[PDB]
CSV table of C-alpha atoms in Angstrom, one decimal:
chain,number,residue,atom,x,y,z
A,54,UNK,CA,82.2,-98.3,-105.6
A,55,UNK,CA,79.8,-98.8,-102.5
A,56,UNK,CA,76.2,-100.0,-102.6
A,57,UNK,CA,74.9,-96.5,-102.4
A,58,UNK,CA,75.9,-95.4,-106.1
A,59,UNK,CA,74.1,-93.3,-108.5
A,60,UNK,CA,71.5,-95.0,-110.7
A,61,UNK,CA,71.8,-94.9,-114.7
A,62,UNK,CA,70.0,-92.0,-115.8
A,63,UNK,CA,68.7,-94.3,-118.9
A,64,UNK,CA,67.3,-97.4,-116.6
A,65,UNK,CA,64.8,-95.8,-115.2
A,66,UNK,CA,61.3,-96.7,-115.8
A,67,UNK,CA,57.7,-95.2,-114.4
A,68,UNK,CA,56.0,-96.8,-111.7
A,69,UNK,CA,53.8,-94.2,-109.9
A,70,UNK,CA,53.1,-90.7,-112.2
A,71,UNK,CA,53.6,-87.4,-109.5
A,72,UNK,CA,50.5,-86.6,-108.0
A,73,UNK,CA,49.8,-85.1,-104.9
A,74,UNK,CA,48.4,-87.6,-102.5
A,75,UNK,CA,46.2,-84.7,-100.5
A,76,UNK,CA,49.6,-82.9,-98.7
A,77,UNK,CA,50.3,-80.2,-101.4
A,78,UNK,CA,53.7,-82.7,-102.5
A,79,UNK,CA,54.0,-84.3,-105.7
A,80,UNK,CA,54.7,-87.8,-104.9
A,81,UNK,CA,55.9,-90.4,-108.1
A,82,UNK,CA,57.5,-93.7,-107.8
A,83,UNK,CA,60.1,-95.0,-109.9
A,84,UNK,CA,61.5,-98.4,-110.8
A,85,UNK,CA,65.4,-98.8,-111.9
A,86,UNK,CA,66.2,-102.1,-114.4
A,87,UNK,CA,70.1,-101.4,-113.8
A,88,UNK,CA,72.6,-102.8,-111.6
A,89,UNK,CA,74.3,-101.5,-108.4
A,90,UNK,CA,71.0,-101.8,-106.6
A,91,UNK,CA,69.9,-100.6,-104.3
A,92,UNK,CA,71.0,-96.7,-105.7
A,93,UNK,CA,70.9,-93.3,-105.2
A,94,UNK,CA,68.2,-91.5,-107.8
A,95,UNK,CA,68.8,-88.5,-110.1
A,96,UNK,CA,66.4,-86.4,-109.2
A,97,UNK,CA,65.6,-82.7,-111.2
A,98,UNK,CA,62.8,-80.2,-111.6
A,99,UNK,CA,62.1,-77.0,-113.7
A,100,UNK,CA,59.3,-74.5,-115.0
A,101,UNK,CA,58.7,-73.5,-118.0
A,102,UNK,CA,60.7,-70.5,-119.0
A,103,UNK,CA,63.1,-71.6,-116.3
A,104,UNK,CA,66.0,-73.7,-117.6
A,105,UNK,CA,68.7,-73.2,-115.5
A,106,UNK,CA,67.2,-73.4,-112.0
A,107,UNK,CA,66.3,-76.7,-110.4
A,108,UNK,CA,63.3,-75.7,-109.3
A,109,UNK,CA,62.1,-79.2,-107.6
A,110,UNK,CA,62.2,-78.5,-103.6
A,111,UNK,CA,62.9,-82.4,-102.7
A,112,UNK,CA,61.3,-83.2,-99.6
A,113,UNK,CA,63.4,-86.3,-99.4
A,114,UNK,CA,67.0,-85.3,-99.6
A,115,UNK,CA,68.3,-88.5,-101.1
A,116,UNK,CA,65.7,-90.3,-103.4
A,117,UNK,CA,66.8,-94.1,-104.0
A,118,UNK,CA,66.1,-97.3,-105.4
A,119,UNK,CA,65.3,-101.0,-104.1
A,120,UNK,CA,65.7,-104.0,-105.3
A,121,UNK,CA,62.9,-103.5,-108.0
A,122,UNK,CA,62.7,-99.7,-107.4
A,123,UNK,CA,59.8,-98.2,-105.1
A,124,UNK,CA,61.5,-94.8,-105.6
A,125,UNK,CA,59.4,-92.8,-103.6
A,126,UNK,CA,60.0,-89.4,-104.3
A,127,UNK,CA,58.1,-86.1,-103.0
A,128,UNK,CA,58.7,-82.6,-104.1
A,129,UNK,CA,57.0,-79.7,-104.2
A,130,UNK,CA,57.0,-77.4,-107.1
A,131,UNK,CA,55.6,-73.5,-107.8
A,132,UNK,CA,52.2,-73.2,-109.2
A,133,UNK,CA,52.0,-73.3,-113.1
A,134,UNK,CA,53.3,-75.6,-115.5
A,135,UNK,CA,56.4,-77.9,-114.6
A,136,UNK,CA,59.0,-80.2,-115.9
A,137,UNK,CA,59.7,-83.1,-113.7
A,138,UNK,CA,63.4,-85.1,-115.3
A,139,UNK,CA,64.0,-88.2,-113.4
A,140,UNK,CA,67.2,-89.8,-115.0
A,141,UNK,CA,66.8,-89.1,-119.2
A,142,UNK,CA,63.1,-89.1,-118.4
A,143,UNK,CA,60.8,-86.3,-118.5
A,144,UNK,CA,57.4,-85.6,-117.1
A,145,UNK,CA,55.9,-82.4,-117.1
A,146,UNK,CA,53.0,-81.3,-113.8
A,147,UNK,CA,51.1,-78.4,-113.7
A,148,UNK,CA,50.5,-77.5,-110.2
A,149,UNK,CA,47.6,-75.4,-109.3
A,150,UNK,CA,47.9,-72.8,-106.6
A,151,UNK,CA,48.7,-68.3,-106.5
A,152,UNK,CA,51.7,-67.6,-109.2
A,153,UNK,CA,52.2,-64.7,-111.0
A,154,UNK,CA,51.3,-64.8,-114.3
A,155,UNK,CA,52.5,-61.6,-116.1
């Protein structure tokens, strides 16, 4: 395998909770405790009531991990409540904005 691999879903840790820095992008950082660094981050978003569409629209096409991590990642996500999955963790963000409610 090269440098450039995927990361372990299960070694990844928080270092920066998403939060929009003032640009309308949710920005989180993440730090990786695995080998095969630096990697290549799993990266998924949904809402609620959607399952079965990633609905994270990555602004950075190809998230990735240091030495110690720094995994900057920004996407931006539809107004409501969110799940953000990074590797086997979860973190949900409720984005404010127009969205149709019912």
């Amino acid at each position: 395998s090269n440098t450039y691999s995927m990361c372990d879903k299960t070694k990844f840790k928080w270092k920066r909770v998403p939060v929009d820095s003032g640009h309308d992008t949710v920005v989180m950082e993440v730090s990786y405790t695995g080998s095969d660094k630096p990697c290549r981050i799993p990266v998924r978003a949904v809402a609620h009531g959607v399952p079965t569409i990633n609905v994270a629209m990555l602004i950075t096409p190809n998230p990735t991990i240091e030495t110690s991590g720094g995994g900057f990642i920004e996407m931006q996500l539809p107004p409501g409540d969110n799940i953000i999955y990074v590797g086997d963790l979860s973190q949900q963000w409720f984005q404010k904005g127009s969205t149709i409610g019912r």
